[PDB]
Short mmCIF file of C-alpha atoms and ligand atoms in Angstrom, two decimals:
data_model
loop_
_atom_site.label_atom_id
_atom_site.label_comp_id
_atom_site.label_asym_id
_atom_site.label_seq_id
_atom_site.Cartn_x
_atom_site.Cartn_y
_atom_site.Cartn_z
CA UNK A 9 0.00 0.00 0.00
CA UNK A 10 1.34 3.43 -0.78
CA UNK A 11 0.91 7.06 0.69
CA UNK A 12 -1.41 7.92 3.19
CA UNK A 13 -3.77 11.39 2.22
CA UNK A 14 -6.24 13.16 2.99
CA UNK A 15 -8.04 15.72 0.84
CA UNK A 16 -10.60 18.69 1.52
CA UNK A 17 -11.92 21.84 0.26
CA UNK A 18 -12.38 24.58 2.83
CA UNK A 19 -13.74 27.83 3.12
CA UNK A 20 -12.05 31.25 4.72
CA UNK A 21 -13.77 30.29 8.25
CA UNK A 22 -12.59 26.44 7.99
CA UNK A 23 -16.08 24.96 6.18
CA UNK A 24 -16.67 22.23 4.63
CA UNK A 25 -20.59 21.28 4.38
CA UNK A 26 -23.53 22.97 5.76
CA UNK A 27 -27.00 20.43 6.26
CA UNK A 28 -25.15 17.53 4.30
CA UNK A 29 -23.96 19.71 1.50
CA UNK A 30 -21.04 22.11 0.49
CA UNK A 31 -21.44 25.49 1.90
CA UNK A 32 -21.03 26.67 -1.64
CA UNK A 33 -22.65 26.55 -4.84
CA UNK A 34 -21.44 23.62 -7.31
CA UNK A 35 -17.51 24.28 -8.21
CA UNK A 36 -17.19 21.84 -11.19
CA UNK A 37 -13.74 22.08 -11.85
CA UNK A 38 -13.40 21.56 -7.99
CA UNK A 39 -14.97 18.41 -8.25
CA UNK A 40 -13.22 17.53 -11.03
CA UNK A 41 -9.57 18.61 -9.45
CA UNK A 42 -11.43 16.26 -6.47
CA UNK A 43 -11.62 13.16 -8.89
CA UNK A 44 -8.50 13.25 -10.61
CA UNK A 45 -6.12 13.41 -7.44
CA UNK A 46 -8.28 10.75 -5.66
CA UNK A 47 -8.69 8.33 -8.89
CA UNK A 48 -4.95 9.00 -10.49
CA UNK A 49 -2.66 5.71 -9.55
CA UNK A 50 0.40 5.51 -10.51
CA UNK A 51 1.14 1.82 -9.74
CA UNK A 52 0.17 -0.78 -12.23
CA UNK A 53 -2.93 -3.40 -11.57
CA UNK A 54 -4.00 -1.14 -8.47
CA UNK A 55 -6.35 1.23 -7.51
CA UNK A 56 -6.89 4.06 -5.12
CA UNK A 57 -8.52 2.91 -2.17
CA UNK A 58 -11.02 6.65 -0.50
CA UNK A 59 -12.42 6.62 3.28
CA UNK A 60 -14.81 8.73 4.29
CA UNK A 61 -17.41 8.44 7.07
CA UNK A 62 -21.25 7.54 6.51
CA UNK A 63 -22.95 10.99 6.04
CA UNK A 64 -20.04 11.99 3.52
CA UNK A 65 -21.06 8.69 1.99
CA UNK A 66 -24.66 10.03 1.94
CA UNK A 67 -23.49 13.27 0.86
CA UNK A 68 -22.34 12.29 -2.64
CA UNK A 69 -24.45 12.68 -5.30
CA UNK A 70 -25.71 9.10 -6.00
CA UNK A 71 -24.68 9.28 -9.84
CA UNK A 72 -20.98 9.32 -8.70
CA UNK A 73 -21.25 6.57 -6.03
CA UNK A 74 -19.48 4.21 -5.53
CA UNK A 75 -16.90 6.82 -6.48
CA UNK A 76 -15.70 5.29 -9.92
CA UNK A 77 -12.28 3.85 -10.54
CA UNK A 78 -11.41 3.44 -6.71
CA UNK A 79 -12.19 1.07 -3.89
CA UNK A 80 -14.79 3.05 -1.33
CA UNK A 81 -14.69 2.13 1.97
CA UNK A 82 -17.27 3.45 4.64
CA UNK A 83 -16.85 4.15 8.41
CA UNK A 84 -19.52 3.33 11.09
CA UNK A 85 -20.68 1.98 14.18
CA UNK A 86 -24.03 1.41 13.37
CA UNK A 87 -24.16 -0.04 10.10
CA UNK A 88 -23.78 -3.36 9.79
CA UNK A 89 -22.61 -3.89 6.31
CA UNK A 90 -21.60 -1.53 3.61
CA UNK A 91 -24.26 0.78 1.81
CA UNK A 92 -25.74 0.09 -1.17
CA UNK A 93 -22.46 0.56 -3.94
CA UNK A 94 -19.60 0.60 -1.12
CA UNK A 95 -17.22 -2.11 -1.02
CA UNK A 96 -16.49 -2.36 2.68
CA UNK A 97 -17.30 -0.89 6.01
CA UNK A 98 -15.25 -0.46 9.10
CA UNK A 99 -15.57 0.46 12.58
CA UNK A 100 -12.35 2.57 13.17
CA UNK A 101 -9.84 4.64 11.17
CA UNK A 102 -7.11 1.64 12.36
CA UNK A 103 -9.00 -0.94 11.48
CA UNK A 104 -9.79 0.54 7.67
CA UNK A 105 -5.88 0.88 7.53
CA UNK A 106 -5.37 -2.54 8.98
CA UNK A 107 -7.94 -4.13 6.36
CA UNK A 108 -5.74 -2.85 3.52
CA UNK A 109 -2.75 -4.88 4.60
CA UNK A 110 -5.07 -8.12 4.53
CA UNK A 111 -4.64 -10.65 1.98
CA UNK A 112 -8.25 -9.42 0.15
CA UNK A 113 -6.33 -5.58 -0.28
CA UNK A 114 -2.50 -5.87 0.46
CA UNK A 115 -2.21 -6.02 -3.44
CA UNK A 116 -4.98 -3.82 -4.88
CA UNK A 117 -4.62 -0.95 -2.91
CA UNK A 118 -1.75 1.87 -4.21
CA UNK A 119 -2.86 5.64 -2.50
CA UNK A 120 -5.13 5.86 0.38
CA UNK A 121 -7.37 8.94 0.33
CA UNK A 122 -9.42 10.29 3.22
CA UNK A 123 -12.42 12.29 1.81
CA UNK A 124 -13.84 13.28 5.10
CA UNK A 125 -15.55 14.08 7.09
CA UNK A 126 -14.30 16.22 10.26
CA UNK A 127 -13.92 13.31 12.73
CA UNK A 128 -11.70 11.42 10.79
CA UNK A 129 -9.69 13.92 9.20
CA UNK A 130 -8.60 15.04 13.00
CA UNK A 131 -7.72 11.65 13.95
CA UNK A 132 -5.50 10.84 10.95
CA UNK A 133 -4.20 14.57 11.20
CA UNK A 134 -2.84 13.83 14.80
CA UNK A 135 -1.51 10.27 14.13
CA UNK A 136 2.18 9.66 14.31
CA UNK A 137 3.79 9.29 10.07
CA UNK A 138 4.18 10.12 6.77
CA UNK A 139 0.91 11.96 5.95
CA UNK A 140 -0.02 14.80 2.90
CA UNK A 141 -2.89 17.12 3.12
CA UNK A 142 -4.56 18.21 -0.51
CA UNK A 143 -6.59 21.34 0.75
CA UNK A 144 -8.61 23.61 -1.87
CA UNK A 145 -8.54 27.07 -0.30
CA UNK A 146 -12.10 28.69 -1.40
CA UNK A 147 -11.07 32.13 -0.82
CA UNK A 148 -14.56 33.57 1.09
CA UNK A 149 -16.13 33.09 3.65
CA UNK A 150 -19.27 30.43 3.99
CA UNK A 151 -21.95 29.72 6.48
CA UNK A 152 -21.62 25.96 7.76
CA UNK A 153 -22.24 23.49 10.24
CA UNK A 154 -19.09 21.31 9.62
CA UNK A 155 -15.64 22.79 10.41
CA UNK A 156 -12.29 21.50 9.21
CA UNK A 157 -9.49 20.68 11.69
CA UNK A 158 -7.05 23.05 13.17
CA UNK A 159 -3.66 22.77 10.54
CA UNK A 160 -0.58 22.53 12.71
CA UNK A 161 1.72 24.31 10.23
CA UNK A 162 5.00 23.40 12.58
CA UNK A 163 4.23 20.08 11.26
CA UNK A 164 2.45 20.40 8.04
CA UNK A 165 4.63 21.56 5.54
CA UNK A 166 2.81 23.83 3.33
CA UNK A 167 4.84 23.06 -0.52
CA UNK A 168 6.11 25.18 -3.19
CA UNK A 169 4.46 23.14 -5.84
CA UNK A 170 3.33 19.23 -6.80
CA UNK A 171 3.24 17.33 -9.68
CA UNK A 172 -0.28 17.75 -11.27
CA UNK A 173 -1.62 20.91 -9.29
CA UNK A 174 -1.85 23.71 -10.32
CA UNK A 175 -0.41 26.54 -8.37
CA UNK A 176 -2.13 29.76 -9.28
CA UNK A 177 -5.55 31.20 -8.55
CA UNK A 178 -8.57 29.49 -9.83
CA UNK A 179 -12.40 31.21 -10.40
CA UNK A 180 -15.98 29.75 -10.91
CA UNK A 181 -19.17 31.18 -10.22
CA UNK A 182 -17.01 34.26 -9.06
CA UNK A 183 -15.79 32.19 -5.97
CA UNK A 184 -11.67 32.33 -6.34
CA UNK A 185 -9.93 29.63 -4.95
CA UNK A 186 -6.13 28.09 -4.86
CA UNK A 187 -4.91 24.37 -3.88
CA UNK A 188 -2.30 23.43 -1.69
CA UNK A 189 -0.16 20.45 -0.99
CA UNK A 190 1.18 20.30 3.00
CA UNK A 191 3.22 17.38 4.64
CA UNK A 192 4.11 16.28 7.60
CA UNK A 193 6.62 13.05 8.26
CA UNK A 194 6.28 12.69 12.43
N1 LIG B 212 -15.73 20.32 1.59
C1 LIG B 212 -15.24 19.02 1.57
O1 LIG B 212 -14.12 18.75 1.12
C2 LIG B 212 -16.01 17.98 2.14
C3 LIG B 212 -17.29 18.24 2.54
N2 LIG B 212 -18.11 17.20 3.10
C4 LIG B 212 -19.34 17.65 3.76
O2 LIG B 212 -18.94 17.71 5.14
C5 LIG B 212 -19.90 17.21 6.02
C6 LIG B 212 -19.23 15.91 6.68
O3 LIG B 212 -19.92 15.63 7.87
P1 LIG B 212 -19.34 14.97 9.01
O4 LIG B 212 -20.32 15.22 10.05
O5 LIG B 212 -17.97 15.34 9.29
O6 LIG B 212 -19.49 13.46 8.67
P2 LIG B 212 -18.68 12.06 8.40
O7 LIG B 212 -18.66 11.78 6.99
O8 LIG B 212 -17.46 12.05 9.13
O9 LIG B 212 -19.76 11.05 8.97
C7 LIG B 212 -19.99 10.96 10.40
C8 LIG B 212 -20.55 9.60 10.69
O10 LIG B 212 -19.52 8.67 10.23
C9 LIG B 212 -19.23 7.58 11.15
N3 LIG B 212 -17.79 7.80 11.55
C10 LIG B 212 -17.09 8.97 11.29
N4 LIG B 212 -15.82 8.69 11.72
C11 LIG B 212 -15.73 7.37 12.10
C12 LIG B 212 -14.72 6.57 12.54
N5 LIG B 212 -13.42 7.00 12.65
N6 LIG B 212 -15.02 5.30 12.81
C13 LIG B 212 -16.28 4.73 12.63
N7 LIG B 212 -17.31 5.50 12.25
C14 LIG B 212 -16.99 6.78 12.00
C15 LIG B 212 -20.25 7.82 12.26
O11 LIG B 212 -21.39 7.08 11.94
P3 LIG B 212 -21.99 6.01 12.91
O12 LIG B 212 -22.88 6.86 13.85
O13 LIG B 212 -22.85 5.20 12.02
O14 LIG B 212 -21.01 5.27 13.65
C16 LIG B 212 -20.51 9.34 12.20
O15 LIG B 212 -21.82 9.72 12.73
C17 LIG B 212 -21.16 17.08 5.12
O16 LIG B 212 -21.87 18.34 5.05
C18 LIG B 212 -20.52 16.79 3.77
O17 LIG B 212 -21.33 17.22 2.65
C19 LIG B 212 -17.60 15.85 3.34
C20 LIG B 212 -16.31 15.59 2.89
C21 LIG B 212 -15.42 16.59 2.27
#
């Protein structure tokens, strides 16, 4: 299994969804930036493996789930089997990163992408290793119910530039925004 991610978008005041939605209107290009860094593997016979709890599960519009072209896996306690078009469930952050060095994964899985929500983007955030944040900065400021965890930038590394994003200011729907590639190794 390769790197260990987690990617966001994230408004001026730290949101990222308001009543099981984004706090802003559709960014397609966003979505598309989304897709591309989660599906893009550069291993051959493997695929990118995304987490994400059960309402961002819920949250995705139904005619992209599962998310194409990568292995979705679900967190929760109460359900007791994967939704409807996931591939597997688990009941911790651990155990989803334990499953992929089973015998079923060990083999099929190159990068590991967390797609949120809050919870488990803090816990992997604070865990001891090699870990890479893929944030959209959306440059205003939007109303929301679901806040993005505190950045430590003495550990996350904001960097100059990566492979495959771009680094200058992007617009749609008059909403500017930028992406950003930090890393931390701890
Ligand atoms: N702007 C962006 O980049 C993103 C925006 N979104 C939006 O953000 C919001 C996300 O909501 P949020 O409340 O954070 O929801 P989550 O997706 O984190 O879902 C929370 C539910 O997931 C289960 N869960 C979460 N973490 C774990 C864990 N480590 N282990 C086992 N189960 C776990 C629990 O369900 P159970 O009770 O069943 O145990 C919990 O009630 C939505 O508005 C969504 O649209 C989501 C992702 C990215």
């Amino acid at each position: 299994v390769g790197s260990l991610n987690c990617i966001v978008a994230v408004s001026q005041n730290m949101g990222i969804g308001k009543n099981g939605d984004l706090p802003w209107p559709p960014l397609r290009n966003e979505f598309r930036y989304f897709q591309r860094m989660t599906t893009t593997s550069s291993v051959e016979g493997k695929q990118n493996l995304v987490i994400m709890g059960k309402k961002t599960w819920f949250s995705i519009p139904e005619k992209n789930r599962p998310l194409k072209g990568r292995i979705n896996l679900v967190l929760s306690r109460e359900l007791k089997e994967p939704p409807q078009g996931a591939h597997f469930l688990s009941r911790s952050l651990d155990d989803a990163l334990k499953l992929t060095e089973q015998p079923e994964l060990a083999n099929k899985v190159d990068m590991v992408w967390i797609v949120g929500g809050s919870s488990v983007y803090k816990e992997a955030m604070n865990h001891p290793g090699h870990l890479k944040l893929f944030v959209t900065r959306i440059m205003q400021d939007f109303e929301s119910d679901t806040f993005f965890p505190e950045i430590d930038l003495e550990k996350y590394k904001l960097l100059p530039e990566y492979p495959g994003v771009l680094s200058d200011v992007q617009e749609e729907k008059g909403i500017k925004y930028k992406f950003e590639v930090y890393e931390k190794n701890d």
